């Protein structure tokens, strides 16, 4: 899994720790062991969410399997809670692009998964 | 719907009101309330179009519907025209990624749209 | 072609001349012009990958066309090598996501490819 979120939350705002909470959180909730899942926090983003610059987010999650209604239901509950409690962005200002990957489509480590 | 532009053009060359104008105008391509509208510059990149760095810029739409050759090609005209006039990037030197995504995948306020 | 590298590697480390490379090497690998490839390499970011914040990328290749399982991992070496010897990147700490677009789904010069 690879997740992204994209903020206009300021770098100072984001808390220590928060990269390695998002690992830990999306290995469980995901299933996939923790080495797979990498994360990407980008800050002080000039961005608007329904015409307004209060605090927002954009985020996509990419992973090879592991996408559904329900599984994406309960991803979308986790990452709305992590970035409500540790960046204070309320959850109706969260986008979250789930994107179901084919293993041929993903390359790692010289290869791909397929 | 979601929009992002990445460019080298300079912050300081990004007018005031940009994204306001993009929400306004996204909204009324698409049909969607501008509340449901979010967009995103990142200027000052390190990019290339076609082996040069002249402005340019390379971006994604997501949208759940209201994606389609026809309504793509207005879109991107609609959208090479404001990069055009306010970013004064060429329309040659513009991409536009256009993702038709499902409602079960997209993630906001703790749940899905499903 | 368009190709992104999200990566923690500082931009002082990222060579004079690595758009460039990165450009010539897509026409080759694609077969596409150089005129079609836009590359965009963003260093200093905050991301990590398996939990660790040693060096990673994270990366995109959108193409209409020229993605596939054999052509997918012909891109990888590539790509992998070319991360490693000129950002000095393991390759078991890059992810690449090809994405094969069709035609009508690409805006481009106020309209689309179709
Ligand atoms: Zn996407
Ligand atoms: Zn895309
Ligand atoms: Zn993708």
Redesign the interface.
Known sequence: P?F?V?TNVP?AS?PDGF??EL??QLAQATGKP??????????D???????S?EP?A??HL?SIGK???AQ??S???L???LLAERLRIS??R????????NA?????????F?
Chains 1, 2, 3 share one sequence.
């Open positions: 690879m992204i994209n770098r984001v990269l390695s690992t830990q923790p080495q797979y899942i990498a994360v990407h926090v980008v800050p983003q000039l961005m608007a969410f329904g015409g610059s927002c954009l985020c990419h996408i559904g209604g994406n239901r991803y979308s509950k990452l709305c809670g959850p109706d969260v986008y979250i692009n789930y994107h179901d990957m041929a489509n993903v390359g790692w480590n010289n290869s791909t397929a």
